[PDB]
């Protein structure tokens, strides 16, 4: 009977308040019950009106934006319109009580008035209202208006007009005393411990411990720290319910098992919403001292209490290693079956999976996950729903969407939950609530067990037809309206779980989402927040322990214990993980995040880029060293054979002196290049994944920070390291310069960044819109230009995905959330076929499809989804670009032939340098792939000809230097 919410312990205050409320209600007077949340206004009302066979309760929860039409809609299924107009209730023997909860919540207009409050004043004073369609007067006959509201001193509560409160008697309800709460939960704990009769003497100490913990956490964790630190006796009721569930669905219990079970429930009810780690430590010490004081046992940290039924038939504490292995195998099956995503399982992920599972296994168990973006909220929710047999439903709310789409989605979900009894987990992001009307609809859905205005009129009648058909399908014997609708709301409460995903709790819309009354009092708040440094250490180690990293000598640095986040440093891998974590922390600190959550997506992207880049670089270095060593060995063997023992062979041997000395120099430099490989790969990954949205000065400052961090942990790196000299080759650079790039180092770096993002789509922020034509020139005629503002963009994008062309979507600040599957790369694989779900029907990905997003408006509105899941790159005009463009224009307008000759000479010289490099590579390959003498003589002659051509072509550079020195003044004045 603990699960039944109609159970009330009769105390002195309870029976007194119930009797006075009933006596006031029988006097035909309005009643406004005042008091802090969790006082028990609704409780004493339900207790008073439950035993009466002549009153009925109608429950409306008022939101910030509540209108009269909501009250009318919530009453049309309970009342009738009879012209005797008169709004009589449907029942002829029982009156109707219109419970209007949170009256203080509907907002004031521009002129300081409330529509709902004035409507209720009209209801109780004039006993009627005016009906808007046909302009007629109705007369309320047997409806009593009873309200419940918090004191106006609470934030979010506004003062009420005295013209409305004059007609309503007011009863205040404070919190019960600590002795009273101890007695109440002592009765609940006796009821629970009837399941375990051999610990029947511990009911009172457990209740005293729980009430003491509640009082202490209310004293410590008040509203002044965070807005969501609102504690109530409802928290103790939730703790009692969780204790009963974990006892009933568990094995035979002992004292240590009971204490740890209760402490786990206390962690999940009270400390789940805590933000700071200091508050977590305070709660840990509070639990320690409470158990020591009242319950005279192992470690009681959050990670050490892992109670789950995923491994057995009972809810019991399980080991971390076997749980991690089980979750890994189940997630492998999930990635094979439903959605393929390469994410790493860690201890915090395991704990969050356990608590989401605990929330979803409840009845009417809704959850509100709060944390940074790319933390793993929606995938964890979908995985837990898949483990529990739920059906995931994500509303495809996009741009150019209205109330009708969301109402249809909610109606379909409700119909599936009730008619088709399909248990459904609904994921609602903060970006799926476009307007406050959606939030009000969801608040009404959570507060009640349906939405009333979605079923009105002929829609209501056809809903009755469908439910009657389904009820005769099950053979249940019920005929009246009330029993059928009770079945409806019970089925919705049983078979629907709502999950809220919030990425920026500081946002005003998300703040209203959190501070909503029904969302706060029903959902289980989970403040995951950002990743603590232990979790980042775990995931970084788990995804870099599969690469060649330890191939050089490593002297362990002597650093502070507080500056090491991993295990004590013994290898290069731990140093790399600590370096990356330190740079992530320093980057988030120096970008002035404030108290906003910090998304770990940059860390994960940097890790993956480092993995693939160090794998490729190590393979290339090993191959090059093998080639140069076998080439030197072959040259030595040929020289020895010639000495032991023909003019062409002698000339070929004598003509490879420069090649021999270059090869010897490379073999000498192999050790130095192998020592500094890991640091170069780290800095390259940081450039790829961190520095996209930075100017040159911020990039230099962050590079200085990264270099001093990288030298702190005794990791070597190239002193003259450069991104262009490392990631940009001559082939790529010449292709870009033929495509139309500028001669800027910054623009070349950004082009290398956008052309190496094979995982996440690149976001181009180019105000001049030159990169549109640049990338159109790169892919030739296969490039297609789409926009988010044009009709028919969906079908064009689907056709381009089916064909496999390269798509550039303009206006990136008007992001359309239908392509969230394309941005997050949540593809599905059908053998050799890769399909993605765009809009409502899945389409086939050809594999040559590429996505670019462009936006020419700086300081635009980029959603945190797109912002976290793309490689955003800025394209700004720096000083060097100004000087170069000004010089090019003035040289074209001064001596056009000179400028044409100069640009042709530069293109020719760099083309010959590329040809010389390719010739050297071909020479090495042909030497290692052993007629041939003539081929190598021709190669040597071609190389000599190219060298002579460059020597002749370098006779005009001082004139260009004199020209740029002459025009530097106009360049600097222009900038």
């Amino acid at each position: 009977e603990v699960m039944r919410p109609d159970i009330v312990i009769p105390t002195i205050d309870t029976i007194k308040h119930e009797k006075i409320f009933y006596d006031l209600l029988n006097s035909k007077r309005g009643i406004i019950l005042c008091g802090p949340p969790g006082s028990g206004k609704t409780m004493i009302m339900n207790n008073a009106l439950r035993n009466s066979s002549l009153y009925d309760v109608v429950g409306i929860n008022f939101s910030k934006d509540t209108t009269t039409e909501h009250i009318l809609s919530a009453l049309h299924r309970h009342t009738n319109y009879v012209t005797t107009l008169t709004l009589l209730p449907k029942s002829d023997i029982k009156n109707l009580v219109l419970f209007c909860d949170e009256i203080n919540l509907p907002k004031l207009d521009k002129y300081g008035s409330q529509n709902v409050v004035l409507f209720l004043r009209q209801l109780m004073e004039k006993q009627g209202f005016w009906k808007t369609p046909e302009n007629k007067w109705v007369t309320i006959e047997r409806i009593h208006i009873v309200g419940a509201c918090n004191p106006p001193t609470d934030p979010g509560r506004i003062p009420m007009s005295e013209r409305f409160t004059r007609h309503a008697a007011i009863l205040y309800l404070g919190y019960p005393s600590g002795k009273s709460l101890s007695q109440i939960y002592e009765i609940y704990y006796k009821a629970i411990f009837k399941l375990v009769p051999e610990f029947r003497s511990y009911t009172e100490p457990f209740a005293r411990a729980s009430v003491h913990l509640y009082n202490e956490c209310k004293a410590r964790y008040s509203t002044g720290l965070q807005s969501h630190y609102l504690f109530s006796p409802r928290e103790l009721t939730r703790l009692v319910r969780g204790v009963y569930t974990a006892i009933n669905t568990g094995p035979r219990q002992t004292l240590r098992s009971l204490i740890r079970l209760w402490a786990y429930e206390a962690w999940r009810i009270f400390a789940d919403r805590l933000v700071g780690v200091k508050e977590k430590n305070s709660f840990e010490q509070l639990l320690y001292e409470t158990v020591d004081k009242y319950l005279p046992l192992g470690n009681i940290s959050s990670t050490s209490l892992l109670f789950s039924g995923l491994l057995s038939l009972d809810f019991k504490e399980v080991n971390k290693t076997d749980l991690v292995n089980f979750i890994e195998e189940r997630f492998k099956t999930f990635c094979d079956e439903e959605l393929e995503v390469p994410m790493v399982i860690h201890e915090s992920m395991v704990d969050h999976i356990l608590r989401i599972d605990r929330a979803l296994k409840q009845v009417q168990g809704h959850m509100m996950l709060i944390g940074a973006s790319r933390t793993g909220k929606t995938i964890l929710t979908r995985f837990v729903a898949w483990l529990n047999g739920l059906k995931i439903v994500q509303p495809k709310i996009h741009r150019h969407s209205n109330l009708s789409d969301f109402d249809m989605i909610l109606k379909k979900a409700i119909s599936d939950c009730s008619l088709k009894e399909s248990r459904t987990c609904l994921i609602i992001d903060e970006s799926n609530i476009l307007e406050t009307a959606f939030l009000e609809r969801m608040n009404t859905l959570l507060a009640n067990a349906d939405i009333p205005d979605l079923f009105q009129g002929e829609e209501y009648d056809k809903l009755l037809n469908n439910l009657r058909n389904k009820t005769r399908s099950l053979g249940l014997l019920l005929d009246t309206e009330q029993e059928l609708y009770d079945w409806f709301v019970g089925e919705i409460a049983k078979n629907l779980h709502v999950v809220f995903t919030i990425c920026d709790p500081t946002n005003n819309k998300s703040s209203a989402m959190i501070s909503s009354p029904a969302l706060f009092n029903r959902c289980i708040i989970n403040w995951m927040g950002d990743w603590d440094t232990k979790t980042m250490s775990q995931v970084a180690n788990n995804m870099v322990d599969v690469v060649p990293m330890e191939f050089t000598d490593f002297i362990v640095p002597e650093v502070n214990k507080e500056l090491v986040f991993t295990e004590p440093i013994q290898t290069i891998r731990d140093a790399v993980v600590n370096i990356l974590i330190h740079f992530d922390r320093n980057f988030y600190q120096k970008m002035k995040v404030g108290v906003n959550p910090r998304s770990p997506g940059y860390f994960i992207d940097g890790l993956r880029a480092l993995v693939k880049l160090v794998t490729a670089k190590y393979q290339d270095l090993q191959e090059n060293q093998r080639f140069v060593n076998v080439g030197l060995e072959k040259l030595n063997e040929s020289v020895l054979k010639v000495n032991e023992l023909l003019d062409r062979s002698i000339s070929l041997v004598k003509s490879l002196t420069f090649e021999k000395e270059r090869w010897l120099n490379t073999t000498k430099q192999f050790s130095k290049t192998s020592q500094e490989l890991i640091g170069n790969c780290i800095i390259s990954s940081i450039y790829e994944t961190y520095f996209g949205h930075l100017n040159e000065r911020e990039r230099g400052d962050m590079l200085v920070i990264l270099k001093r961090l990288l030298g702190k942990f005794a990791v070597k790196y190239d002193v003259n390291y450069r991104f262009i000299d490392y990631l940009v080759t001559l082939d790529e650079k010449m292709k870009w310069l033929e495509c139309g790039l500028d001669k800027n180092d910054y623009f070349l770096e950004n082009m290398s960044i956008v052309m190496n993002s094979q995982d996440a789509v690149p976001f181009l922020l180019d105000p001049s819109s030159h990169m549109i034509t640049v990338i159109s020139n790169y892919y030739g005629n296969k490039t297609v230009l789409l926009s988010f503002l044009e009709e028919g963009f969906v079908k064009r994008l689907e056709n381009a995905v089916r064909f496999g062309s390269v798509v550039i979507i303009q206006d990136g600040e008007f992001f359309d959330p239908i392509i969230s599957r394309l941005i997050s790369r949540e593809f599905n694989h059908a053998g050799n076929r890769v399909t993605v779900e765009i809009g409502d029907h899945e389409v086939d990905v050809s594999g040559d499809f590429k996505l670019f997003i462009h936006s020419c408006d700086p300081s635009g509105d980029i959603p945190i989804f797109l912002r976290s899941r793309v490689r955003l790159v800025h394209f700004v005009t720096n000083k060097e670009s100004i000087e170069t463009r000004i010089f090019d224009i003035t040289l074209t307008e001064e001596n056009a032939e000179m400028q044409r000759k100069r640009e042709d000479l530069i293109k020719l010289n760099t083309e010959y340098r590329l040809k010389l490099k390719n010739l050297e590579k071909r020479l090495l390959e042909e030497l290692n792939n052993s007629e041939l003498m003539v081929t190598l003589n021709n190669l040597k002659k071609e190389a000599m000809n190219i060298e002579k051509k460059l020597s002749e072509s370098e006779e005009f550079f001082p004139q260009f230097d004199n020209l740029v020195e002459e025009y530097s003044i106009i360049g600097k004045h222009s900038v």
Binding site: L311, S312, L313, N325, E329, G389, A830, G831, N832
Partner: protein, 346 residues
């Protein structure tokens, strides 16, 4: 010869390159065939298990299931078919002279990954059943190489099938069972009562040696030739079903188009992967690193093989006892995700 129970310890420990997905027993010679998640197909002797006899990589993707057939003719070789994730069913040949796998042909026709196959000989003609992720269950012809009939019995993709002559029951991902008469290609009955996707479903073939669930109840069921079915799902449960008799191509009775759970076995700690029937027992394996043995008469797990593998347990099988052409030898082989194969002998 029928009430044999395997010992506490396995007779041998066969090591395979990666996760073992399916294992099959040769009905005639003591040799076991082991599939592989890497796509390989091994063949290990029952007495010299250190080295394989023949193995080859035919699929580029993971093998999902396989079965063998010792063909007999009234006018004589072992046929190995193998489903995989490559949308293909490769048919092999087992020559006993030099113990080498001989590839016969590759069977195509599925638009998605194929899960289960079944092979049987009917009057000197052999047919190959198949079910895939494209919601299509098919029965093909080995000699002709072409398809014979294709139909879609389930709203979600089908995961396992089993054939009793011309009747096939096909469990699927939509938590339901359906019996379809293959030559007519129409559904007959539905099995509802599971809440999680069906892992493997198979018939309860009759025996004459008393077992409660392997005997006919009425003369009409004996004339039909099938009465019961067993299905294992992800609900950690093994359910025994009862097939209602249709109007006898059979015509489904509208008021008798639903199954009836005769018995529901419970006690597994995770997804029940594979099931098998020997005599009065129901050998089953699950993801709890355990193998049960449920007595069919009493519905109790008489023996539990706790921690047989250190990982998941995928597949097992016994010798078919309802067929007089195969001697029901007392050998059991069990594979799992631990990249190991355990064989129980004597």
């Amino acid at each position: 010869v029928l009430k044999w129970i395997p010992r506490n310890l396995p007779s041998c420990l066969i090591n395979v390159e990666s996760s073992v997905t399916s294992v099959k027993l040769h009905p005639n010679l003591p040799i076991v065939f082991v599939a592989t998640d890497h796509g390989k197909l091994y063949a290990f002797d029952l007495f010299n298990y250190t080295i394989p006899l023949a193995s080859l990589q035919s699929h580029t993707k993971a093998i999902t299931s396989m079965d063998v057939l010792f063909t007999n003719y009234t006018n004589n070789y072992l046929v190995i078919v193998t489903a995989s994730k490559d949308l293909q069913i490769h048919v092999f040949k087992w020559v006993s002279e030099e113990c080498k796998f001989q590839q016969i042909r590759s069977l195509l026709g599925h638009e998605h990954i194929v899960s289960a196959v079944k092979i049987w000989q009917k009057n000197n003609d052999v047919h190959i059943a198949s079910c895939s992720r494209d919601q299509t269950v098919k029965i093909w012809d080995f000699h002709n190489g072409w398809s014979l009939k294709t139909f879609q019995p389930h709203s979600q993709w089908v995961r396992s099938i089993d054939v009793l002559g011309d009747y096939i029951i096909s469990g699927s991902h939509d938590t339901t069972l359906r019996l379809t008469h293959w030559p007519s290609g129409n559904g007959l009955s539905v099995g509802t009562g599971h809440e999680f996707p069906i892992e493997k479903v198979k018939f309860i073939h009759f025996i004459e040696d008393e077992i409660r669930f392997r005997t006919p109840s009425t003369d009409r069921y004996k004339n039909w030739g099938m009465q019961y079915c067993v299905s294992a799902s992800r609900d950690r449960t093994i359910k025994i079903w009862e097939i209602p008799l249709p109007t006898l191509a059979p015509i489904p009775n509208p008021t008798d188009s639903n199954f009836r759970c005769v018995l529901t076995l419970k006690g597994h700690l995770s997804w029940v992967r594979d099931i098998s029937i020997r005599g009065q027992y129901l050998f089953s394996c699950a993801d709890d690193k355990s193998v049960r043995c449920w007595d069919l008469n009493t519905g109790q797990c008489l023996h539990v093989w706790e921690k047989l593998h250190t990982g998941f347990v995928n597949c097992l099988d016994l010798d078919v006892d309802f067929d007089s052409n195969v001697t029901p030898r007392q050998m059991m082989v069990t594979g799992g995700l631990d990249c190991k194969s355990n064989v129980f002998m004597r």
